[PDB]
Amino acid sequence: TLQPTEAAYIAGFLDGDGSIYARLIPRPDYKDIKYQVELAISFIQRKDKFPYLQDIYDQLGKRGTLRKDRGDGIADYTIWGSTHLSIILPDLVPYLRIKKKQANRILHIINLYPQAQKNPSKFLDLVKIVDDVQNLNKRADELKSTNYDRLLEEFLKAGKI
Amino acid sequence: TLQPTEAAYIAGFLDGDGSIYARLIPRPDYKDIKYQVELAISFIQRKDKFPYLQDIYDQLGKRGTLRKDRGDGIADYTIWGSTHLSIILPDLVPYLRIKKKQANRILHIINLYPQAQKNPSKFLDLVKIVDDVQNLNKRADELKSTNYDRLLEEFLKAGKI
DNA sequence: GCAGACCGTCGTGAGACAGTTCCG
DNA sequence: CGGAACTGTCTCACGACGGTCTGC
Ligand SMILES: [Ca+2]
Ligand SMILES: [Ca+2]
Ligand SMILES: [Ca+2]
C-alpha cells in the first residue's frame, strides 16, 4: 500500500509537473443529456525521463494508462474515471498544496454525479463546479469558462428545464 | 525540524518545478585561482503563486532568497552556499528521484572544496564534477559543457600547472 | 581578495484541455 | 447506450544558467 512519504512526494510532483482538470465532451449518441463529464489527473514529462513516470504508475497500483510519446517527444501518465480518482485522490489531498482545491472539487463532482446524470437541474449544478475547476487553472486575466451559461440556454431552449 | 513528509513533498516539488545546478563565476579580483564555484537549488513558479514558495521558505528555516518577480511575471526562490546545502540537501536526498544525482554530486563538491580552493590540480578534479552536474541537466543531443577543457587550457597557459 | 546577494533571459518542457474511436 | 481508451495541439510557465554589484 501507499506509504505516507510516497504519497507526499507524488503530491509534490503533481503540484509542479502535473495537472488536475475536468471537461465536458459532446456525445452525439447520448439520450437526454448529450455530454460526458471527464475527470482526470496527469503527470507530464520529457520522453527521456519516462521511467520515472512508470515508477509512480506502479506506486498508484498500475492504475490509468501510460504513454511513451504524445507525438512531440513528451510523455504523459493519465488517470481518468471516478473509480480510480475516488481511491487515489484521498491519499494525496492531505499533502497537496497548489492543486488541493482542484482535487476537492473533483471529489465533490464524484458524489453528486449519480443523481445528476439523468436530471438536467442537478447536472447544471454539477457543471457549475466543472467551471470552477477550470477557472482555478487559469490566470486572473484569462477568459473564465462558460459551461453553465451555455448549458442553461441549451436546456431551456430544449424544454428540459 | 523538517518532517519526513514535508521533505518528501519538497523533493517532489523540486523534481517538478525546481532546479539543482552548479557553475563557475569568473572573478577577476581573485588571486591565484580567479573563479568562484557556486552551488544552488532553486524553485520556480508564476508570480501569482508566490505564497507557496514562501511556505517552503519558512519550512526550510528561512534560508536563501525569495523573489516576487524576476522581471518577467515569474517568481523564484534560490538557495546558494555550501553552508545551507550541507544542511538542507541531506534532508531531501532520500526522497529525491529525478534530480537525486545532481544532489549527491553537489554534496561531493562540498567535500572536495576546502583543499581545491588553493590547489589548481584539485580544483580541476572539482570542475569535472561541475561539468557532470551541468551535463545531467541537458538532453543527450545537447552539447556537453566545456568547463574543464578550457580551465586546463588556462592553467597551462598561465603556468599554474 | 573574498563571497554573499541583487538584476536579467533564451529556448524549450511542460500543462490543460480537445477530437475521435474504440469496447463488451 | 455509457464509459474507457486512443489521438493530437496552441500557449505560455517554467528551468538553467549569465552579468553586475555591493559592502566588506
Ligand atoms: Ca507547475
Ligand atoms: Ca520539470
Ligand atoms: Ca514545470
Side-chain angles (χ1 to χ4, degrees), chain A residues 13 16-17 44-45 49, chain B residues 14-18 98-99:
Chain A
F13 186 65
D17 277 352
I44 305 83
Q45 199 68 184
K49 297 176 180 181
Chain B
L14 175 52
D15 273 335
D17 276 353
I98 295 187
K99 306 174 187 285

Side-chain angles (χ1 to χ4, degrees), chain A residues 95-112:
Chain A
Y95 304 114
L96 284 149
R97 302 189 189 181
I98 300 184
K99 300 171 205 299
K100 180 194 278 283
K101 287 189 188 83
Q102 277 75 328
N104 290 138
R105 304 291 191 274
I106 299 283
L107 253 38
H108 181 231
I109 288 171
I110 294 165
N111 65 53
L112 300 169

